[PDB]
Structures are given as C-alpha cells and as structure tokens.
Amino acid sequence: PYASLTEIEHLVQSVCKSYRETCQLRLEDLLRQRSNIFSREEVTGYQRKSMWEMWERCAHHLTEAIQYVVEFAKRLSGFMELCQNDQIVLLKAGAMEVVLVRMCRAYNADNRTVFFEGKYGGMELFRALGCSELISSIFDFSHSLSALHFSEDEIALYTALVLINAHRPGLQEKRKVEQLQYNLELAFHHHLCKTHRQSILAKLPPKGKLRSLCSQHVERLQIFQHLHPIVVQAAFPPLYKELFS
Template identity: 30%
Template sequence: MSRDSVRYGRVPKRSREKGDDNRVTTSGAEPTETIFNEMQLATFEMIVTLSQAHYAHCSYTEEKTRGIMRKPAIFTSMDEYGSPQSDCSPTSVTADSLEQQKINMWQRFADFITPSISRVVEYAKRIPGFLELSQDDQLILIKSGFFEIWLVHVSKMFDPIDNTLTFSDGNFITRQQMELMFDHEFVSSIFNFMIGFNQLHLHDIEIGIFAAIALCCPDRYGVYDAKAIHRIEEKLYEAMKIQSARTRGFDSRYHENVVVKVPELRAIGIKHAEHLSWFRGNWTRLKLPPLFAEIFDIPKSEDELLLVAQ
C-alpha cells in the first residue's frame, strides 16, 4: 500500500478532533465557514473510504500486479467427446471454424473476467451513499458499469508494444484474439482508451475514485432515482479534484483531461452492450460462468443470482 493510503488511514481521526476543537473554541466562526470545513472533511473521508475499498477489492493495484508471471492464454476447442483440439489462435481460423472458435474464446474470456465481478460488487458497496440507493438502482449501476470499471482496472496491464492485455492471473490475450471476439473498430477504441488513460499516470487512489465515477452514472438506462445518483457523482468528482490537487498540485488542464475520459469510457460501454447481443443470440451454445451470465443479462438455466446482498 502506498504512503498516501497509510497517511489517509490516520489523518481523518485527527481532522475530526480538530474539527471538534474548532466548534468549541471558535463559536464566533461564520456558519458558511463551518459548513465548508464539514464538506471538506466529508470529501476527505470519502477519499479514505474509496482508497481502502480499492486496495481491498481490486486485483490490479500496483502492489498486486508487481511481479506477475505472464503466459499466453490458451483457447482450445473441444471435439464431440469433450477432448481438446487445436489451439484457437487467429492463424488457424477458417471460414468453417470461425464461429466455433469465437464461442470458445468468449467462454475463456468470461472465465478470466468473472473473478472481478464479485470484487467490483464489494467495492461498489463501499462507495459512500451507494447502499442508500434502491436495490434496483444498485443492480442497474453494477450491471451497466461493470465492464467499464474492469477496463479502468485492467488498463495498466495493457502492453502497447506487443498489443497484449494481461489478466490478474498472468494470462494474456493478443489484439488479434480480441478482434476475433469483437471487431477491429471496437478493440481499437479499447486500446486507444487504455493508452490515453495510462498517460494520465493516475495513482491507485485516483484510479479507485475514477472507478466510482464510472459506476455512479445517473444517465444509466432504467435508473429510478437519477438525482440521488447525481449527488453521489458530484461528490466523487470533487474527491477526484482534491486528491489530484494533493498529489500533483491543482492543474485545471490535467483535471479536464481526467474528466474527458469518462464519456469516452461510457461510449465503449455502450458498444460493448451491443456486442452482447451476439452472446444472447447464441446462449444455448455457450457454457458461461453463472455470475458472468448474470452480470450481462445473458439467459441461463441456473437460478438468478443476487449481486447485491440485502
């Protein structure tokens, strides 16, 4: 854990004590000043909470990814007896095998992503104000925002030299393999986002805040209380501004560069949702982890899973 996060774990108590002293000794303080100090403390505590949640539930922190042993992901097809056939590499693609290879790759890709789902759910519960939303709104935000949050987390594992993306267990997938699953345009948008996002050089704490911003979008289709979500979103943006100013000095242009990545990320999320229509049309041919099927609303025979605990 970084020094910043260690300091964050200690300061709120002192700040709270200082705030208590101020209320006793500065009875003549202006009400607006008191309100401002309380808002600052609330924002500071939000940063602490998000930092702790990020370190606890993200598999792609600086510490956790240090020293990962990379290995190429193996995508194998099965014959009628369930035995592995040849590796599903793009060089072996033919017109007859393309559809089956795409299915095999989707299934393996789902296996790689699924462990992050429960982690994102647990992280979301720690976002101040999130559990105060209706359970329906919580589910909508998690389901519609999961892929975007996962991209934020995994971005640091993108290698622009060999065009590979490495998962938390060390398996990596190539650009060609991803294009076989999706298409060239969509994969280009993902990699371009990752390049730009990595150029911001966000620290783990800032990534934790950014992920919360990505999740708490009041414009998600179907949400009931958009105003409540918007209030959380505003607080998260303020937290990002304060944290960025603390670590690198306030730079309005830098802050704007961070903010503009949000709509870019959401555009990718919308495109990903469109690709899921292929999933839903071929669900009878897929063997997906139940939690993966649940998060993306893909039909399955298993009972529905509850992502957010009562």
C-alpha cells in the same frame, strides 16, 4: 453534503481503501509480470481455438472481474444507503465500465500487451473472437489511460464516479444519487488539486466513450449468441447473461 476539508479527505481515504480491498489484481503483481509474455507458439495456440471457446473464456474472466466491482460498490460510502432498484441500475449500467477502466492497470503501453490468463499478449491473441474492432478499441482506450500514468488513488476515485452516475435511466432516488456523485466529485477534484494533478481533467475520456465500448461489447455478444445460442445458454456465467443479455 461534505462541508469541511477534513470530511472531504475522509471520503478520499475511505474510497481508496474500498478500492484496494476489492482489486482482484495487485498493481505490484501486474508490473513484475510484464516480462512474462506469450510466445509465438502460444499466440498461434490462442488463434487456433474456436470462436466459442475463446468467448466462453473471456466471459468467464470478465465475470470474475465484475464480481470484484460489485464488492467495490458494496464497500462504497453512500451506495448501500441507496434503494435496491437504484443499486441494481448503477451496477447494471456501470460494472463493465469500471472493469474497462481497471483494465488499464493490466496494460503495458511499452509493448501494447494486456494481462490475460497468466501472461501478457498483444491484441492478435484475441483474433478467434471475431471482434477486432471491439478489441482494438479496448486496447486504444487502455493505451490512452496508461499515457496519463493514473495513480491507484486516482483510479479509485475515478471508478467510484463512473459507478455513481446520477444520469443513469431508471433511478428512483435521482436527487440522492446526485448528492453522492457531487460529494465524490469534490473528493476526486480535491485530491487532484492536493497532488498537482488537475492537468489530467482535460485528458480524461469523454463520457460517452465508456458507453461506446459497452455498447460494442453488447452488440458483439448479440451476434455471437445468434451464432452459438446453446453455448451461451449452457456455458456462459449467469451473472454475465444477466448484465449483457
């Protein structure tokens, strides 16, 4: 339990630091690359790729993103003090949710494009995946977060809470995770109060929204795996399969 303001502010700076250290993509880099947009020729190229090649490429890049989220957790105060069961439960449920939130940084609301393999492209880039519902949902979600003008520090505190969620089924030290979650909640809300940003509280996504996105991801994978079981077995990252089946 964090009692003084100085303690709470120490948590804030600690969380923000752990975040900055474990982003794979610098905000500055993503912003200054925004003019670098796939041409119609390249978009057509993406649309002509097989469903299985596109899934493999997507599963690969997401897996790399997940690895940075694991590093983020390993650097988070409190997380490494939890038992290994609980560490795994939190990452299993939360890693993809954190990726989805971090993705808003790589999203340009001005033209509805996302950073993918070196350039920005709209959602039509992903048509070969055969999961437009999932894709447009992800895009709408990133759009909603972009409208809030999330700061880097807000992203750090919000993703720490996404991860440190005491309601995850299968936790052995529920009360310990609860205490960590509460301390992080005070840190997030203190920072918002300090920065006159508490108006974002009502505008943050409803809890089950992130869960809906991860469920859709799993559901689409299941269908893909049924169509291409050898591809998943032979060409999907081991970590990705472990997390998503």
